[PDB]
A and B are shown apart, each in its own frame.
With several copies, the nearest count.
Chain A
Amino acid sequence: TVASISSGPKHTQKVPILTANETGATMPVLPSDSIETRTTYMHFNGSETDVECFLGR
């Protein structure tokens, strides 16, 4: 799984960082929408935040 993909300079008409929060959504913006990133992998599953785990001790 990639945690971040590689992304480079941008000069577009397509701006993912401008939104309208009045709508009630949290738009899924990522580091790679606003800086230049390199690939990295997650190495993690989110196992210990499962509700079974959270309420299970």
Chain B
Amino acid sequence: INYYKDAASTSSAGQSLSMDPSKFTEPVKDLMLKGAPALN
């Protein structure tokens, strides 16, 4: 129950439960498959 009118006044947000490290761990242009050779 929100007792207040504005959105800033609500409690903390709830877990992204998004999670996708590939923008950080695999930003390569041509896709690399694990097990296939790195450099062909």
Contacts and interface: CB of A to CB of B under 8 A. Distances in A.
A and B touch in the complex (CB under 8 A): yes
Interface of A: 14-16, 18-20, 23-29, 33, 45-47, 50-53, 56
Interface of B: 12-17, 19, 25-28, 32, 34-39
Classify the interface of chain B: helix, strand, loop or mixed: loop
Given A19-B38, A20-B39, A27 B12 contact: no
B15 A27 contact: no
A28 B25 contact: yes
**What 10 A-B pairs come out closest when comparing CB atoms?**
A20-B38, A14-B35, A26-B25, A16-B34, A52-B13, A16-B35, A50-B15, A25-B26, A19-B38, A56-B12
